[PDB]
Symmetry: C3
Subunit: 336 residues, 3 copies
Amino acid sequence: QDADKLPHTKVTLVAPPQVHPHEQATKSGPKVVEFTMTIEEKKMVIDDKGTTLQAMTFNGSMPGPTLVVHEGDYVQLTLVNPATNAMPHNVDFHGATGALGGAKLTNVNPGEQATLRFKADRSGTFVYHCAPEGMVPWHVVSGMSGTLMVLPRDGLKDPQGKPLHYDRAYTIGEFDLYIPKGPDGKYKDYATLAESYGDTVQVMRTLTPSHIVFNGKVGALTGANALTAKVGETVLLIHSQANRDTRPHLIGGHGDWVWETGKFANPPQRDLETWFIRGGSAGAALYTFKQPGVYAYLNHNLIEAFELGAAGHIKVEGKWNDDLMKQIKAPAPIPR
Amino acid sequence: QDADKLPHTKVTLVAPPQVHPHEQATKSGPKVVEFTMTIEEKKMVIDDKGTTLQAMTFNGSMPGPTLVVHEGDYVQLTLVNPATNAMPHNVDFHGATGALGGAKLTNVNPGEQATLRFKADRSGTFVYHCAPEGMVPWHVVSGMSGTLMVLPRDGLKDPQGKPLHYDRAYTIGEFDLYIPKGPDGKYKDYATLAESYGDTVQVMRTLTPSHIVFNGKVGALTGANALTAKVGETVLLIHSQANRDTRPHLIGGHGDWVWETGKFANPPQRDLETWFIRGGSAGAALYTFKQPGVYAYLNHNLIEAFELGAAGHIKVEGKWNDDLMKQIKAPAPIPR
Amino acid sequence: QDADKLPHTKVTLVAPPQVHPHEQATKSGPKVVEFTMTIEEKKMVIDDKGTTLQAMTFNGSMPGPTLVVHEGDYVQLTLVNPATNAMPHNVDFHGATGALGGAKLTNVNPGEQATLRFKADRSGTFVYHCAPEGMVPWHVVSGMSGTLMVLPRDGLKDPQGKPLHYDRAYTIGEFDLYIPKGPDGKYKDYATLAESYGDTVQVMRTLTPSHIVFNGKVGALTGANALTAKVGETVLLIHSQANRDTRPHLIGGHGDWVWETGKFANPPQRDLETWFIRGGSAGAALYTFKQPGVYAYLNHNLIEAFELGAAGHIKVEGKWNDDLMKQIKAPAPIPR
Ligand SMILES: [Cu+]
Ligand SMILES: [Cu+]
Ligand SMILES: [Cu+]
């Protein structure tokens, strides 16, 4: 179990909402899984009205990519902070033990890189996020978080120990954004990242987000960018919120099996309408589609979903099943 | 299990906080249970100071009535939108599968009605609410939600599979209201429903309710309108919140058995002081009264309960039991 | 089980964050455990900038002391309200049955005392707080709450019934404070408790705390006042929030076994990154330290922790373990 004498393997990370290829149950024994992530500070457009955010990301996306390993593996991360950035960064992995989650061993100034190794000895979906001393909330709310999924080597199980399997996995990061507004009643635009700080902390202190989005922007997962699946497929929906609570719900569907605290050694709950993801954590739900059509996947504080942005869509192909639901009488004049 | 060849039965719905008569465990096999609900848009008085709300309700009450069926039954709902209303409505049942919870098949303009059938294949208390495309939050926060309770055909069970039974069931809907205030520091009064929209969405976006009430108004379940029970009775308290989290607690009592996510195939938790109902869901608690006296049942954010309105009372008859609690020394001068 | 014929014993309460000596599993049968608490109304400094609060406390601290008994014991509390106070007080124990948690039997004006006895028949960590008719929220948010821990007579157990034991127990109370600000943008200072009321209720109604602190002040458990432990020790962290939700997390660690609803007859959850304490309740987590260094224990709404005050530290002695985490490459220039 010395880590230095185990096999090493390299994973190529992909952008949300996809998750990189991986095996659910594995026969292999423990390995050292190597990942690389580059920090990118950039100004991004977060709504359809042209509102901008001075953002900070892991690999250029919000959320950062999901990293997948099995319980007992060692995560070996190379964190790269290019010289074109302006701030220092680091990473705090909630799935790791010690040193402020690794934050103490990964302080990197623009133009520096560092490599950390930690044992992933606890299964579940865990948040990771940047956490620079004295500036923690700002880097997290500007976009620096993602998920680490540690699968049990034997794959997911139901409460009676029966095997659960998914066909497809999607990762949704939910971000509460605090964009300052000026007297016009218009959101401010900033020339540089550093210039947005002072105003942004004042909005943060009110505890009221201006926008709450899935994966980086209002409408990121709606319409043309909907998630896709087919009747009969089992999807795993990973949902992370590194700062604020959320309450995910699939309209027209359910959470067949849900780990809302996100830790796979505990028995999941079944048949949930709406589940709860505590700020600072990631959770996961399984659902097998039974009806075709468009579904909405959203935070069920409906002001947060429809007014502030926390809603996405899943487009499902297949044949309607009239036993589950059937219009007996279409809308028509009442009888007189 | 074709639904069209099953027996059909009609249920007469009653107003909250009562729940219509039903059997807990049943010997009968699956049926098609027919319900009818009429939408009523009306201006209502929501506090003791004369504040009004331009409300929207299912059957004239907030919340709408609780509908009860057994797992495996088919719900057959006729939704009626009279010509005296002004808006279009529909219904989204969280206990249903497909078509945005039924919302896609029940779009009814004033003067129209529609009938939907869906299989209630998952046990638990589920929210239902109106959800018209582009106006979802407004119809929900104006009062359109209630609960569907799907009991397991064998009745409720504890974690070891031992039977649980209740003598009486009560249904509480908890509503976060967003009533606009003008410069006077007085709540606005609107001539029509449509006129309240613009101002109401501005209050909604602040995420801060002006009032949070049980069943339609401050004091709906207090004093003279308290709930009632007797020492030795087991009550089932159903609590729904279609938009915002809440944390119910009975002062002087406990949740003997609680399904806070509301789904009866999962084991309940025992001895809770305070439980958590996620916005967009309904949950249920069982309690057997052991002491007489007045109890308060409230959201335990005590500002939300005592300042904003989310508190009610339960008046219990019976004999005091000095073993459970006893005043040893009444209040008196300290000794000098 | 008559209480008057059982043995009586007196406990000497200590200030948070310590907890008074007690046995986990006990051979003794039920007893009447006598406690005394004195109310102290005082002006306290709650931050490092000199902000004051007109506070109200049980025994001069926030939170009040933790009282520990075993399931089946009888709690016998003498509540003392000295003549130097200005307000009436009482106590509501969530672990008690009847009479509004005991509040009805303990109304004490300045210069009076009362003694209440109640049977602690349900195991778990329970909140207790003051609750005077018509002034409930104000006494609770000004500081009057603490925890009652009722241990199972056989000690704590894991989900398979295997014994769990802790070496050390710490109690953290988390307080959402509502301190009024005047036009200067400076917090108001009040000559008397009664004078702070009117302004304080106006801030309360916005639902936005000015400060959220652990044990009475920003920095109460940081730096020099950190909690302490050693690698190999198992700590029990009791966390109470009598009014508002919170989401505790240990940076660099986990919740090995957590009862987030706080009731020990239910199976705990394992490997949590972040857990959830519902406003109006207390919960408990166990953790065995595996790495030395400084840990932060905080509410993982990172604005509430770092901007508003809800963060503390745990300083752990011992030897680093390179298998769990190891810096492979310290921060250095990227390669060119
Ligand atoms: Cu950062
Ligand atoms: Cu409607
Ligand atoms: Cu008090």
